[PDB]
Amino acid sequence: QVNNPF
Amino acid sequence: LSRRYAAKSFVEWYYRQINENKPVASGYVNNNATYTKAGHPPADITINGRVVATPEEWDTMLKEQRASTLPIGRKPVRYDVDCFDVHVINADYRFAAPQRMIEQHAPTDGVRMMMALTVSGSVYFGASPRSTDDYVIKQHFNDVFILVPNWDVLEKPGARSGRKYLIASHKYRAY
Amino acid sequence: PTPLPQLPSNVRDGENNVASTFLQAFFQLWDHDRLTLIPQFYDSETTFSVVFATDSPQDPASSSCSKFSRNLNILSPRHPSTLQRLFVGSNLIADLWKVLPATRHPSLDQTSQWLIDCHTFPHLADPTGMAPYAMGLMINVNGQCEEADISQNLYGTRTFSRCFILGPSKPGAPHPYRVLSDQLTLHTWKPQ
């Protein structure tokens, strides 16, 4: 559930 | 302030090991008890654009680099640090953290720091141990590290030796 | 002894190719309209540093940095930059960027002119607070640029390193990501 924009 | 002491201590340790032909693998997260139990991924290591699977292999590559074709009185490889700089990129680092370390150290205490460290200097091949002018090859190097807290050493009573912050990521460039 | 093999740029920035999109924008704007990068990718928490790896004679960036430091002492004598050795926030970063020398970088198309290594890494803080962690993107650049010397009105050649740490942006930001950390290392400057 990581905030990952990449 | 805390980040600078941590960076200075790490830089002094890391390049001293290399220059004394000693291993640096113990400075990486891979061989840490707490991060291993927590399932931290292997340290991400790139050496001149080659992804290296483990700190142990990096130690072997350093050995191979220093192997001679050299006259007597020459040191095969010497790293000279010219500058470094450190930024905290997460002052509230929590991964694998003992609960007590979160409660006792707010992000302003300068303990639970994830740091971005950059280091630059020269690599001397075949130079006399204290010479910067009689080398065979001279490279510029640029190292970058992401450092994370060593939960097993930080404020561990009786811990005298050991690395306070460990390498989670490492990119090496020399040319 | 044999120096470690040198391989090309190692770009592992994940599905969205942020490193390509960011760096394309960055070095284009760095040359032509530097300050517009600040509202696009920088915020109140971004940290910036310039460090010198050598002592080139007539180093133009060194002169401008010394003038900046002097002026900062005149206007803001007890600013923490003295002991912290870094600049925090869009506002102060902009002032320094203004005095750093004008530059011309080669196109990113010239792959051999650039050494760019990047990878995604875990355990940044989530600025939205919705998740326990955020992913980060580390981008390290080694290259050369033309760097102006105003004393002669001529471009010299600068060798530099620049390490970016990118992460998810705060809510309401222009882009899904932001620069957390920007570390510029200036190596040799040689007159052309």
Residue numbers in the entry:
A (entry chain C): 15 to 20
B (entry chain B): 2 to 68, 76 to 183
C (entry chain A): 365 to 556
Task: Please give the exact wording used by the authors of the publication that reports this structure.
The TREX-2 complex integrates mRNA nuclear export into the gene expression pathway and is based on a Sac3 scaffold to which Thp1, Sem1, Sus1, and Cdc31 bind.
Diffraction quality crystals were obtained with ctSac31−20 and ctSac320−40. Both crystal structures also contained the ctMex67 NTF2-like domain together with ctMtr2 and were refined to an Rfree of 19.3% and 20.3%, respectively, with excellent geometry. This cavity was formed principally by Gly500, Leu501, Leu530, and Gly531, and accommodated a single Phe residue from either peptide (Phe20 and Phe33) with neighboring residues forming several direct and water-mediated hydrogen bonds. Asn380 also formed putative H bonds with the residue N-terminal to the bound Phe residue (Val32 or Pro19). However, in the ctSac3 peptides in the present study, a greater contribution was made by residues neighboring the bound Phe; as a result, this residue only contributed to 39% (ctSac31−20) and 35% (ctSac320−40) of the buried surface area.
